Symmetry: D2
Subunit: 289 residues, 4 copies
């Protein structure tokens, strides 16, 4: 029996979904952590069967989703919840959506898990470039995209057996500048990539639990289209499909199959690493021309 918690899916157009599909391929139970703004919509869609096509793991297996849970990676515990999110329309009718709470919720419903996925970033000010990003926007980008992993680790590490495994998603802009990726997103991925190392040391010696981060190529996810710098993402994708060593469409499932391997024991000797899953685009210095 194998259980994974995937933090950060709102649709089937993301990497979370890709990750979810490949794990199913290996008969691992999938628990979804949905941000509360998009949650009710997501159940509504699910119940109505908009995702039935998308849940097809070819080989006559249906994607096996254990549970779908509200989740906000900005709140550690209940007292971190402010009194405006206490009132908010989307959050009013929901409980147990903080990191501490969903950790407890999952543990009490199903026991210890052994796989953890951090598939969420958020940066209020992504459209304004680094130079023109306010303190508030930066720190918020860091809270939501970087710290959330750390906090996920602190809390979930109590509901994980040894030999467990954690992944997050990052982007190459932390190592090399990509204009357009603003609002501190690059700073945040840079921080995330560094924390992945540090945490690997603590989680390793103390828990025999591994943690790595996947550096993805571009994918036309909802969030990617919202970078809205025909856009940053459509450009990111044409460049990639034309200048990558591997000239094939990069799919959400391509990240999953890698995420899957890392989450398994097969990667028992890899920890602290940023693994590029991106058709090799990062190795290139100049366009062929």
């Amino acid at each position: 029996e194998d259980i994974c918690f995937i933090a950060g899916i709102g649709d089937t157009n993301g990497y979370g979904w890709g990750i979810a599909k490949e794990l199913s391929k290996r008969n691992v139970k999938i628990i979804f952590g949905i941000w509360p703004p998009v949650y009710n919509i997501f159940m509504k869609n699910y119940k109505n069967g908009k995702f039935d096509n998308d849940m097809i793991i070819d080989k006559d297996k249906k994607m096996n989703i254990l549970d779908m849970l509200p989740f906000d990676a900005s709140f550690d515990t209940a007292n971190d919840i402010d009194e405006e999110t206490k009132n908010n329309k989307r959050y009013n009718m929901l409980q147990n959506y903080t990191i501490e709470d969903v950790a407890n919720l999952i543990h009490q419903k199903y026991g210890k898990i052994n796989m953890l996925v951090h598939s969420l970033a958020n940066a209020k000010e992504v459209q304004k470039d680094l130079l023109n990003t306010s303190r508030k926007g930066y720190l918020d980008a860091l809270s939501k995209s970087s710290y959330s992993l750390i906090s996920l680790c602190k809390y979930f590490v109590n509901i994980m057996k040894p030999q467990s495994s954690i992944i997050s998603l990052t982007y190459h802009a932390s190592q090399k500048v990509v204009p357009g990726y603003g609002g501190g997103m690059s700073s945040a991925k840079a921080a995330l990539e560094s924390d992945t190392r540090v945490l690997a040391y603590h989680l390793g010696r103390n828990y025999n639990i591994r943690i790595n981060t996947i550096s993805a190529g571009p994918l036309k996810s909802r969030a990617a289209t919202a970078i809205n710098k025909y856009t940053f993402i459509d450009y990111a994708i044409e460049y990639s499909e034309k200048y990558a060593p591997l000239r094939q469409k990069l799919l959400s499932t391509d990240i999953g199959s890698v995420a899957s391997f890392l989450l398994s024991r097969e990667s028992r000797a890899i920890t602290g690493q940023t693994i590029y899953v991106d058709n090799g685009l990062n190795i290139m210095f100049l366009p062929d021309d």
Copy 2:
């Protein structure tokens, strides 16, 4: 005529001072940006001449300090100032200490400058390790150590001629784990190192202004002794003096002479880089033994 603003000195035991001394060696006017907690003490010391020994640039030149100014890299503009720091004993009798303000203050007293130094980090929760650092502590570590550079850049970039140059100080723990360097300091240096690149792109195309970061070896500065993990720093220093390729005491002046070169036109083709000034300690994988 050459002017540098050095943000973050409280004493002569830091890298700021080292940087200050070497710049003098090249007849560049030095403006000090002092954190207001330690400011009055610092003038008190200065007036009393505790730094007279320390201001000796051997070659019968006295260190040339243009001006000493209160400065808090946590506040961008005046309205960012909270009403407790409005009241505070240390800050009560002081004005113009925000980034926007000291930028204006310097500009109006002396005109455009051409050199900028970011020699400050701060992380409330440095003693607690990454895993056990609260959101508040992390974000605060990022605000004070990483964002401050960005904000320094936004504001000072109006009071700098083209061909100007900016440096910050970082530490190798952003790339490789150093247990003890907690509270998000590593995350912060990681972010700082990434922002140094991004900013180099914006500051370059738009202003013809360069920015680089120096990755220092350890030095027994006041702040280093406060990491207080016979301590993290005394250990960091013994290891270095015994396992570095260069087996010589690393001095504050050693960082300065490099900081000096970067701030000069001599480094007109270097930008976005992390430069290791650390007796080569970073190149080593294993102790000799």
Copy 3:
């Protein structure tokens, strides 16, 4: 139906063997390339049952070796053969052991293959440090341990299917200094790591074929002991198990399981990468003790 050529074994004590064991787990035919001086000696042990214990893939299946072949990574083609190797005791009673020769021999007997492994190294002068390494020795290290890969790719790419996969092993001594790892091995590994990118481009664009390199941690293999610099290798294992993030004992299979992954469609989105499989040692800066 899946075939893997592993070039670079002489026994069960190395990484090629672990790599081999883990491929059997997926029912992929293995063809072994053995350095001629030790091939007859290897067949002897094979015939005499010495590897039978080592050949068990736990779950009631014998390791399915398809063929074992004499293979020398220093000669590319027939005419690359010098005339004391026409004479040498060991090579005499052997034929078709050059790279183009074993590519054709394999191709002729079994047709198209789809998984390549470079698992060989040699630096004649490894015991002398880099400064005291002669032209002859340096260059022979690079011919044997770096150029052999390119050669393999050049000749094997003819006998491979699209979507095929290649790996090579490497050691972190290329990126950080390991005193004792002399003879130009470090140099060799560095050229390998870089060649892996470059090859990725040509092999990826032109053949839709991927290539990566596994950077392993220390393993008491025959050649690791032959380093002989207790031993260089006793130190490296000792340190790694005191200091690596993961307390556990590293196994050729740990690396094997990873190689198996890189060699499958499950990683179609990864190429040009150095993947570290070293229980995370590479992420550490200083020890804690």
Copy 4:
């Protein structure tokens, strides 16, 4: 009194020359090591006044060349000399041009020196891409462009003072793929960059002598044009000036000024480093256009 040996010029059109100009600015005697095939041709141009314009260090001082010497980076010692180079038109009327020979010749004429420059490269087969590069060509690239450095250090370290400094040039093609940079040059550069660390250790521990490598941007030198792959080099300069963070035209002096710094006491705390001097191109991922 300061002496620098620059090995690897044939004209005023290269980096050795810019390096040379910038050293004169500090009144350091320069000794030139010229590849024998082009030395007589070089002295001719020298005698005939062709370099006189190029020799002005603006401020009313002629470039002070101490000596120009025949120097071949492929032979270490007298007996390393093959017997068609006993015969060759070009080498015939020349003596003492091996590395140990010119180390002794210099030592004998001028005593101890303290600044070394490796500024030479050759990959016979640069135009063929890595996959199509022969053993002969690969290895000759590595002998000429990587092992020559170590050789220099081995033989020159005898004729140097403590605290002396060494540099070599290198190109980012070792770390990221530049299609067109074939023949094993990239391989060669990679081994150089790594050898620089390793050497740093031995040279630093044993001799208190530093060594670093400058990674430059494209420069239309004689050999850059000889790449001949418009030209590979026209493309690289064109791109660099559209895309590098810094709009300006890169000059051998830009690199020269940096080399001068690395070669002085002003950097006593830097060794084993690759310093990028490329107007910041290396930090970019994608272009904006």
